[PDB]
Amino acid sequence: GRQFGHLTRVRHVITYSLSPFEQRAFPHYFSKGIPNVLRRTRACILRVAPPFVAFYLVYTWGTQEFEKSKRKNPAAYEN
Amino acid sequence: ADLTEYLSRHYKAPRMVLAAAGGLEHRQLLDLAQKHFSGLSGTYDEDAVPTLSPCRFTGSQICHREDGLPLAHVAIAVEGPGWAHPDNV
Secondary structure, three states, rough: OOOOOOOOOOOEEEEEEEOOOHHHOOOOOOOOOOHHHHHHHHHHHHHHHOOOOOHHHHHHHHHHHHHHOOOOOOOOOOO | HHHHHHHHHHHHHHHOOOOOOOOOOHHHHHHHHHHHHOOOOOOOOOOOOOOOOOOOOOOOOEOOOOOOOOOOOOOOOOOOOOOOOOOOO
């Protein structure tokens, strides 16, 4: 186990903070909120999204061919 | 110029108090005060209104971390009432 006071060494940093009863819990919730989640979404679409559409494409084509394999089967049997 | 202007701004009679304690007699003090201090507010200012605006208090916290010091100092306080409030006692 590790306690405060024995964690690590810190040089010259000041930290100002404020009482919760003195500030808002939702500063600019929407004003600053939305823009940021856009920003984080943007920042990550390209690594998260691609594999999922790949699965998405393989899922719809996969069931497609499953029905068209049997149902479509006949087809032609002419004599 | 910054100085002299603060001087004239603030070193005005109604804000000064000649005080003394010991082997004196009050009359002698008054005489002196009237002899060496007469003529300080021979000019009561037009619109210089040295009034103290009340000061907001803030439940807040400042931490100056420095693990190079051998011992820590902490100071915690709550808002007090001020000089004149009987609550002081």
